[PDB]
Structure formats: C-alpha cells, structure tokens
Amino acid sequence: TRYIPDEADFLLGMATVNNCVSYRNPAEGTWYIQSLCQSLRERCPRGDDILTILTEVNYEVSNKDDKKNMGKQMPQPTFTLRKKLVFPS
Amino acid sequence: TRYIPDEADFLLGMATVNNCVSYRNPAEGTWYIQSLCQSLRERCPRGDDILTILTEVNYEVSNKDDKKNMGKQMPQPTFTLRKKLVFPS
Amino acid sequence: XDXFX
Amino acid sequence: XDXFX
Amino acid sequence: DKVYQMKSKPRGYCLIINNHNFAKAREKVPKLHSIRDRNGTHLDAGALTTTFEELHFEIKPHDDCTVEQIYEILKIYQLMDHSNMDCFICCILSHGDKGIIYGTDGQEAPIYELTSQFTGLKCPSLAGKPKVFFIQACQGDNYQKGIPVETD
Amino acid sequence: DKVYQMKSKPRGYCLIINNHNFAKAREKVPKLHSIRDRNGTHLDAGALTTTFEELHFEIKPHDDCTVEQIYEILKIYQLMDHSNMDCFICCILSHGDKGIIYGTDGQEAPIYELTSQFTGLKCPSLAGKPKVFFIQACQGDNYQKGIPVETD
C-alpha cells in the first residue's frame, strides 16, 4: 500500500489573516461567508476548483470597506491538498 | 483610486506544516525545494498557475519517505493572492 | 452593532 | 548527517 | 491534473457550528465583558446550508456551542464511518482571537485542535479524502489597513 | 480569471538567503548545541537560481546570515524601487522551529516579521503585485507520521 502524511488533504479557509477582525453585517451575513457562498454557487457548476474559487473570494472581500474605521479584510486559505478539489453539481 | 488590504497578494510556501521537520538530503538538496523547482520548470512553460504547481509539490513530497524514522513531510502553502499567478516563459 | 467578529 | 532542518 | 474523487451521493457531511449567544462569555470571562451576540449569523448558516445542499452534502447544523460542546460534536464526527463519503466539511461561525475560536462560554479552542481531530490517524475513513474547514471569526482585534492601487 | 501582470523583464528580484554554517548557534544558544551545518544547501540555492533565472527573475543570493543580517537584507529590498517589476520572490533556506527561522547565530526571526516587511504600506512599489516567500526550514522537531491509503 502507499503512505502519505497524517496531515495531508486539508483545506483551511480563514476569513482573515492573523491579528485582525473579520466583518459581520447583521442584516446580510459576513463578508467572507456571503462571498464564499456566492462564488461556490456560481463557479462550482462550471467545474472550477476550490483554490481558484477562494482566490476570487480574496479578490471580492479585498474590495469591501468598513467606512467607519477605514478598515479592510484579507481572507487567507492554507492547504495540504495534494489534488485539485472540485465540487461537481 | 481603489484600496485593497495591506496584506494582500502574498504567497507563502512552507516546506512543512507546523511542529514538524523538513528533510534535506546532503547529496541532493531538500525534498521541498528540489520538488518545487522540478514542478516550476516543467509546468510554468505550460501556463500552469502557482497554486496548481504547489498542489503537485504537495503530492510529490507526500510520497517521499524517511525510512530511518518512518517519517513523512507535508508542505503547506498559505495565500492572500487575489488573482491567478503565472510565471510565463 | 452595525459591525465585527 | 544523512537527514533534516 | 489529479482530482479528488467527488462522486458519492451525498458527498459527505457539512457541519455548521453557528455561535450566536455570548452572554456566558460576557458573564464569565473578564476581558470579554463587551463581546457582542453575533446578530445575523443565521444568514450565514442558511447560505451555507443552501450552497452545500446544492453541492450534494448532508448538512449537520449546531447552534450556540461552548468549547466543550464543539469538541464533543467533532468527536462524534471523527468516530463516524465516512467510508462511503468522498469529502468532509466543517464550518465554524463564532468569535475568535489569534489562532483560536471562542465558544459561547468564552473559552478558547485553538484552530489546530479542531482540524487535527480529522487527521488520517484519528479518522482513517477520511484518509486520502479532502477535509475542508471554513472559519468565520476574528483572529485579533486590529483593523486591517487599506493601500491604494490602480483599478483593474 | 484575472491574472497578475507578469510581463516585465526582469520580472523582479528573487532573493535567496542560504544558511549553511551554524557554528555560532552551536556555541551561543544552549538548546542548539547539536544543530548541524546544513550540508548540501547550495544544491537548493543553485536549483532556485537556475529555475528563477529561466523564469526571468534577477537572482540576489546571500550566504550565511544571522537574524540581524537577514533583517538588513530585507530592509534593503523593502526600500528598493520595484516600480518596474511585476513580482518579488524571497527564498529562505535555514533551520527553524514553530513559526520561526533561525539565523546562523541561532537567534530567531518570526516568519511574519520577514513577510510583513513587504506589505503594501512598507513597500508601495509592490502594492497590488505578488510577493512570494518560499521557506525551507523545519517548523519543530516532530516527525510527521504516515497513513496508509490506496494507490492512485
């Protein structure tokens, strides 16, 4: 049989880089989850993989602004995936 | 003009997940850098992007073994990239 | 209220 | 010698 | 390109830990005396439910979990038989700080302690299969600054 | 799919910090009394040089750097004008531990302290442009265990 690392095949999607806040609009949901779901629903049926989709989430969340504090939010995936990850539909 | 997060557009390629060793063959180089360079040289001229290439590095390094300790090595990229990253050649 | 986590 | 970082 | 097999119906479980009520943190943890209830979090739980049901996952929602309750839920899924699944997804919606999420009680769970319940050794029926964690929480209390760039 | 512009010649700098000689760590840091010189590291420095020169980067190698010397090199590149570059790459080849790399002197540099020298505010001429860091170092002294899976 073959052996791979114990910690292989993980994908961690963080809403923010370390040390920083992530935003929640009480009337809409969070910047990260709402962007993630929109991108998954649009791109998974096209066969796009999750790292491409999460790159788009980074792009979209990066264009949002907190105009009370002049704040931004930078999501951050980390992965030990060894293959492309698609969610066919 | 447009504003994006201060920490946007980074790619961190770690040779190993936290807490663990990464391997260096004194007569060949390290598991991670030698695999990374082989994959970049083969796939960058095809137009493949860096997250796809780093996924292959995860695959290849995951199949290496330290048969003195029965050890493995799991590389781990983390990213705030907002676009696809290609290195044309 | 109108803002983070 | 034959092994890590 | 090798692609993970993604053919089973359902694809796997999608856990949702949806933390709203932080009254216990406010009462018990002095530094969290003002951390707010996470009003609107159900909109994310619902969006994730719609999205991942459309992608053929079986949704398993849990509301208002202390740290001890979170570990208990993860233990239940670590001990489940995922042999006929192709993937596992866990979504955590909560408050957090550097490297951690908070339970509704304001206790801390390091993120690594949550993901490491599903390593290949702890959950062999997911060995070789993608394990995906989405963490919607703060990771500190600093604001991320903006930088000016040219428009695309 | 949006793609980062990657058209300039050269594409940018590719720094290589190639740490081999750890005699000073062995002498000065009690817990590193046995950490070895990194024999063979020049093979990685050379492979990275070949690879990134083929991809049109200007290679900037530095051998045997203490922590203070590493920060000084990064400061030099943070203060350079990257306006005509499309990318920046930094490769660190060294010993390390959890979240850090070691200088040849056995002092510690947190990885975040290295990457954060190139944020958009610290280096505006790289704002909007990809910044890539490759870190070949241990991140602890545990061995990663293997798990059995079916062959592809």
Side-chain angles (χ1 to χ4, degrees), chain A residues 1 3-41 43-89, chain B residues 1 3-41 43-89, chain C, chain D, chain E residues 1-97 99-149 151-152, chain F residues 1-97 99-149 151-152:
Chain A
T1 82
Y3 293 84
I4 63 177
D6 188 37
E7 303 179 31
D9 313 303
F10 277 85
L11 170 60
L12 174 67
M14 299 289 306
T16 172
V17 295
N18 202 32
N19 313 123
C20 297
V21 301
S22 61
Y23 287 89
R24 174 173 37 72
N25 181 338
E28 301 286 323
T30 62
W31 292 6
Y32 180 67
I33 298 300
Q34 297 295 314
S35 172
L36 173 66
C37 285
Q38 172 177 5
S39 292
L40 292 166
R41 302 188 70 187
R43 300 186 75 133
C44 291
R46 292 221 279 269
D48 292 333
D49 73 280
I50 193 66
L51 294 187
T52 297
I53 289 169
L54 285 173
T55 299
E56 174 172 281
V57 173
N58 284 351
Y59 186 94
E60 293 293 331
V61 175
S62 285
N63 291 336
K64 303 189 192 304
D65 301 276
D66 158 16
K67 287 159 181 4
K68 160 81 204 168
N69 306 286
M70 300 303 121
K72 303 293 280 179
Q73 184 175 326
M74 186 67 253
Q76 192 191 54
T78 304
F79 67 98
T80 58
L81 298 181
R82 300 170 306 115
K83 306 172 182 192
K84 277 225 179 264
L85 178 63
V86 296
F87 299 125
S89 34
Chain B
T1 82
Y3 293 84
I4 63 177
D6 188 37
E7 303 179 31
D9 313 303
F10 277 85
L11 170 60
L12 174 67
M14 299 289 306
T16 172
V17 295
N18 202 32
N19 313 123
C20 297
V21 301
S22 61
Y23 287 89
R24 174 173 37 72
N25 181 338
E28 301 286 323
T30 62
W31 292 6
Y32 180 67
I33 298 300
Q34 297 295 314
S35 172
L36 173 66
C37 285
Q38 172 177 5
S39 292
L40 292 166
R41 302 188 70 187
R43 300 186 75 133
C44 291
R46 292 221 279 269
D48 292 333
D49 73 280
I50 193 66
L51 294 187
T52 297
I53 289 169
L54 285 173
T55 299
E56 174 172 281
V57 173
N58 284 351
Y59 186 94
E60 293 293 331
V61 175
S62 285
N63 291 336
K64 303 189 192 304
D65 301 276
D66 158 16
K67 287 159 181 4
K68 160 81 204 168
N69 306 286
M70 300 303 121
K72 303 293 280 179
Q73 184 175 326
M74 186 67 253
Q76 192 191 54
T78 304
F79 67 98
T80 58
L81 298 181
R82 300 170 306 115
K83 306 172 182 192
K84 277 225 179 264
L85 178 63
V86 296
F87 299 125
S89 34
Chain C
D2 287 342
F4 52 77
Chain D
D2 287 342
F4 52 77
Chain E
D1 299 356
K2 316 190 83 74
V3 181
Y4 286 108
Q5 178 173 112
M6 201 60 63
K7 267 180 209 85
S8 59
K9 294 284 193 64
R11 306 288 190 237
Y13 299 110
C14 175
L15 294 188
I16 300 176
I17 307 280
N18 179 39
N19 280 355
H20 172 264
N21 185 343
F22 286 79
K24 184 155 184 231
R26 292 191 293 273
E27 172 197 39
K28 302 263 132 66
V29 178
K31 66 187 223 213
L32 308 173
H33 59 295
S34 289
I35 201 148
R36 290 175 179 267
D37 294 341
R38 298 183 61 258
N39 288 339
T41 186
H42 67 283
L43 301 175
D44 282 355
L48 286 165
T49 297
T50 294
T51 298
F52 284 108
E53 267 179 5
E54 191 165 74
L55 298 175
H56 309 290
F57 286 80
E58 186 169 330
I59 313 301
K60 298 297 187 181
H62 300 84
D63 295 322
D64 290 330
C65 300
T66 62
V67 171
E68 183 182 344
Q69 288 160 11
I70 293 173
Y71 283 130
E72 185 205 353
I73 292 160
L74 297 187
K75 174 61 83 181
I76 286 176
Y77 285 88
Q78 178 236 333
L79 300 171
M80 212 92 68
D81 175 19
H82 304 253
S83 292
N84 300 314
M85 308 301 202
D86 284 337
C87 185
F88 173 71
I89 299 174
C90 180
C91 310
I92 304 191
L93 312 178
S94 195
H95 286 305
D97 210 328
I100 69 99
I101 60 104
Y102 287 115
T104 53
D105 56 346
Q107 290 286 295
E108 303 173 20
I111 291 157
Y112 177 70
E113 204 89 341
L114 308 173
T115 62
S116 66
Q117 302 311 312
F118 298 84
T119 62
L121 291 167
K122 300 206 214 43
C123 193
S125 61
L126 285 171
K129 302 173 187 176
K131 288 157 282 271
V132 184
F133 288 73
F134 292 113
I135 307 279
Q136 167 47 50
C138 300
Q139 287 293 286
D141 67 359
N142 302 118
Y143 307 133
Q144 176 74 12
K145 296 182 190 66
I147 57 177
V149 293
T151 191
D152 280 334
Chain F
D1 299 356
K2 316 190 83 74
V3 181
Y4 286 108
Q5 177 173 112
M6 201 60 63
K7 267 180 209 85
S8 59
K9 294 284 193 64
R11 306 288 190 237
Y13 299 110
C14 175
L15 294 188
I16 300 176
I17 307 280
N18 179 39
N19 280 355
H20 172 264
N21 185 343
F22 286 79
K24 184 155 184 231
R26 292 191 293 273
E27 172 197 39
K28 302 263 132 66
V29 178
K31 66 187 223 213
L32 308 173
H33 59 295
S34 289
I35 201 148
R36 290 175 179 267
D37 294 341
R38 298 183 61 258
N39 288 339
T41 186
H42 67 283
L43 301 175
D44 282 355
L48 286 165
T49 297
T50 294
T51 298
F52 284 108
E53 267 179 5
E54 191 165 74
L55 298 175
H56 309 290
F57 286 80
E58 186 169 330
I59 313 301
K60 298 297 187 181
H62 300 84
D63 295 322
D64 290 330
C65 300
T66 62
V67 171
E68 183 182 344
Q69 288 160 11
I70 293 173
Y71 283 130
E72 185 205 353
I73 292 160
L74 297 187
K75 174 61 83 181
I76 286 176
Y77 285 88
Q78 178 236 333
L79 300 171
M80 212 92 68
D81 175 19
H82 304 253
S83 292
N84 300 314
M85 308 301 202
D86 284 337
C87 185
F88 173 71
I89 299 174
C90 180
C91 310
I92 304 191
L93 312 178
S94 195
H95 286 305
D97 210 328
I100 69 99
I101 60 104
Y102 287 115
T104 53
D105 56 346
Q107 290 286 295
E108 303 173 20
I111 291 157
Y112 177 70
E113 204 89 341
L114 308 173
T115 62
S116 66
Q117 302 311 312
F118 298 84
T119 62
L121 291 167
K122 300 206 214 43
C123 193
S125 61
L126 285 171
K129 302 173 187 176
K131 288 157 282 271
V132 184
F133 288 73
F134 292 113
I135 307 279
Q136 167 47 50
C138 300
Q139 287 293 286
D141 67 359
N142 302 118
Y143 307 133
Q144 176 74 12
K145 296 182 190 66
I147 57 177
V149 293
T151 191
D152 280 334

